[PDB]
Design an enzyme around this catalytic site. Sequence first.
Site, PDB file in Angstrom:
ATOM      1  N   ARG A   1      -8.369  -6.217  -1.815  1.00 49.15           N
ATOM      2  CA  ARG A   1      -7.088  -5.732  -1.313  1.00 49.15           C
ATOM      3  C   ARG A   1      -7.318  -4.520  -0.414  1.00 49.15           C
ATOM      4  O   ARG A   1      -6.495  -4.205   0.444  1.00 49.15           O
ATOM      5  CB  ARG A   1      -6.191  -5.311  -2.486  1.00 49.15           C
ATOM      6  N   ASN A   2      -8.441  -3.839  -0.620  1.00 48.39           N
ATOM      7  CA  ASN A   2      -8.751  -2.650   0.159  1.00 48.39           C
ATOM      8  C   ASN A   2      -9.722  -2.865   1.318  1.00 48.39           C
ATOM      9  O   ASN A   2     -10.198  -1.907   1.921  1.00 48.39           O
ATOM     10  CB  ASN A   2      -9.258  -1.551  -0.766  1.00 48.39           C
TER      11      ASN A   2
ATOM     12  N   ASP B   1      -8.866   2.369   2.743  1.00 42.88           N
ATOM     13  CA  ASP B   1      -8.249   3.144   1.674  1.00 42.88           C
ATOM     14  C   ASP B   1      -9.202   4.165   1.074  1.00 42.88           C
ATOM     15  O   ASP B   1      -9.813   3.933   0.025  1.00 42.88           O
ATOM     16  CB  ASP B   1      -7.710   2.249   0.566  1.00 42.88           C
TER      17      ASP B   1
ATOM     18  N   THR C   1      -5.803  -6.428  12.781  1.00 49.47           N
ATOM     19  CA  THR C   1      -4.907  -7.555  13.028  1.00 49.47           C
ATOM     20  C   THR C   1      -4.789  -8.685  12.005  1.00 49.47           C
ATOM     21  O   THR C   1      -3.734  -9.305  11.910  1.00 49.47           O
ATOM     22  CB  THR C   1      -5.198  -8.172  14.419  1.00 49.47           C
TER      23      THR C   1
ATOM     24  N   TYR D   1       0.788  -1.233   0.000  1.00 51.96           N
ATOM     25  CA  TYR D   1       0.000   0.000   0.000  1.00 51.96           C
ATOM     26  C   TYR D   1       0.825   1.293   0.000  1.00 51.96           C
ATOM     27  O   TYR D   1       0.310   2.370   0.297  1.00 51.96           O
ATOM     28  CB  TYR D   1      -0.939   0.005   1.208  1.00 51.96           C
ATOM     29  N   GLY D   2       2.107   1.187  -0.327  1.00 51.96           N
ATOM     30  CA  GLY D   2       2.937   2.375  -0.359  1.00 51.96           C
ATOM     31  C   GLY D   2       3.488   2.755   0.999  1.00 51.96           C
ATOM     32  O   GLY D   2       3.947   1.894   1.742  1.00 51.96           O
TER      33      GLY D   2
HETATM   34  C1  LIG Z   1      -6.171  -1.555   2.996  1.00 47.56           C
HETATM   35  O1  LIG Z   1      -5.617  -0.925   4.165  1.00 47.56           O
HETATM   36  C2  LIG Z   1      -5.091   0.395   4.107  1.00 47.56           C
HETATM   37  C3  LIG Z   1      -4.892   1.120   2.871  1.00 47.56           C
HETATM   38  C4  LIG Z   1      -4.372   2.425   2.872  1.00 47.56           C
HETATM   39  C5  LIG Z   1      -4.041   3.039   4.090  1.00 47.56           C
HETATM   40  C6  LIG Z   1      -4.222   2.351   5.317  1.00 47.56           C
HETATM   41  C7  LIG Z   1      -4.744   1.033   5.354  1.00 47.56           C
HETATM   42  C8  LIG Z   1      -4.907   0.374   6.699  1.00 47.56           C
HETATM   43  C9  LIG Z   1      -5.535   0.920   7.832  1.00 47.56           C
HETATM   44  N1  LIG Z   1      -5.535   0.098   8.928  1.00 47.56           N
HETATM   45  C10 LIG Z   1      -4.891  -1.010   8.492  1.00 47.56           C
HETATM   46  N2  LIG Z   1      -4.627  -2.134   9.212  1.00 47.56           N
HETATM   47  C11 LIG Z   1      -3.967  -3.197   8.667  1.00 47.56           C
HETATM   48  C12 LIG Z   1      -3.525  -3.177   7.324  1.00 47.56           C
HETATM   49  C13 LIG Z   1      -2.798  -4.339   6.741  1.00 47.56           C
HETATM   50  C14 LIG Z   1      -3.097  -4.867   5.455  1.00 47.56           C
HETATM   51  N3  LIG Z   1      -2.419  -5.940   4.931  1.00 47.56           N
HETATM   52  C15 LIG Z   1      -1.420  -6.531   5.658  1.00 47.56           C
HETATM   53  C16 LIG Z   1      -1.064  -6.060   6.943  1.00 47.56           C
HETATM   54  C17 LIG Z   1       0.031  -6.706   7.700  1.00 47.56           C
HETATM   55  O2  LIG Z   1       1.200  -6.449   7.386  1.00 47.56           O
HETATM   56  N4  LIG Z   1      -0.259  -7.581   8.766  1.00 47.56           N
HETATM   57  C18 LIG Z   1       0.894  -8.297   9.350  1.00 47.56           C
HETATM   58  C19 LIG Z   1      -1.576  -7.763   9.411  1.00 47.56           C
HETATM   59  C20 LIG Z   1      -1.768  -4.956   7.468  1.00 47.56           C
HETATM   60  C21 LIG Z   1      -3.795  -2.006   6.573  1.00 47.56           C
HETATM   61  C22 LIG Z   1      -4.494  -0.903   7.176  1.00 47.56           C
END
Ligand SMILES: COc1ccccc1-c1c[nH]c2ncc(-c3cncc(C(=O)N(C)C)c3)cc12
Length: 281
Positions: free
Chosen positions: A137-138, A151, A89, A26-27
């Site tokens: 993905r979002n 997102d 989580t 996600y950048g």
């Molecule tokens: C779409 O989510 C976003 C897109 C843009 C900006 C913020 C987010 C976002 C907000 N709260 C979140 N919490 C978890 C993850 C998350 C997603 N995928 C994997 C992980 C991860 O690394 N683990 C280990 C859970 C975390 C992503 C986000």
Amino acid sequence: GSPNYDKWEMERTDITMKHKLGGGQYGEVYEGVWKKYSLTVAVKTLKEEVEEFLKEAAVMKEIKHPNLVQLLGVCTREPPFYIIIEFMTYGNLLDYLRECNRQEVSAVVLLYMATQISSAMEYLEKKNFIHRDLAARNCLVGENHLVKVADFGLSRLMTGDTYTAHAGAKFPIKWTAPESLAYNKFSIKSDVWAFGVLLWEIATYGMSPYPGIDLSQVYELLEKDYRMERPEGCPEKVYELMRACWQWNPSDRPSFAEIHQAFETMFQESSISDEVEKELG
Ligand SMILES: COc1ccccc1-c1c[nH]c2ncc(-c3cncc(C(=O)N(C)C)c3)cc12
């Protein structure tokens, strides 16, 4: 009160930054910790443009819903800017579906997921906001299969019934409605189309949409009325809702209000059989 008080502003020193989350998918979004409360959070920042960042922050201060990932705070007085959001989580839904145990994430759980998502979109629809980037993905996953839409970088509060994106701007072909691809026109109905694609992602446990087909061929195919096939195991009702979401004319697509009602109903009936089944073993 103090002159420079701002309810959303947090002190950047309150946050410990750790590492980019989602594998950099996600950048500039990092896993961080709000030290004061020992809370893990997600922090989006800007590398060293701003307008879009600040717009995203502003929109997140305006929406609040059980199935919309929650803004916790921002650091937008001086750079580097931060947008601090609650951390889910179990990560994003696409990866979650791709790695899950299907006896656990069963048919009733997939319906529950769709129900929660359509609940968030019904709320947005009611508030005349558009998301513009609905996709697995979002979407995020929490405990007990809680799901939240995330997102909001392209989300907008509309004044009219349609929003026209900047010129030359381009979008994710496989999740984008025909009128959006062809005329850069977006609306609640274009989000409905994207939701239909999201449903397909859920039904397939995370497969990439339009298997085999070249992105350059997608629009022409849709124009001739081609649409993705019913996934193996997808109930007919769900595939029917899916196809309604993919009606060529935006006005022919159902509302999120209608979509949510349909899923809540299927989920509850499906849930009964699940509880019973659960209570046999
Ligand atoms: C779409 O989510 C976003 C897109 C843009 C900006 C913020 C987010 C976002 C907000 N709260 C979140 N919490 C978890 C993850 C998350 C997603 N995928 C994997 C992980 C991860 O690394 N683990 C280990 C859970 C975390 C992503 C986000």
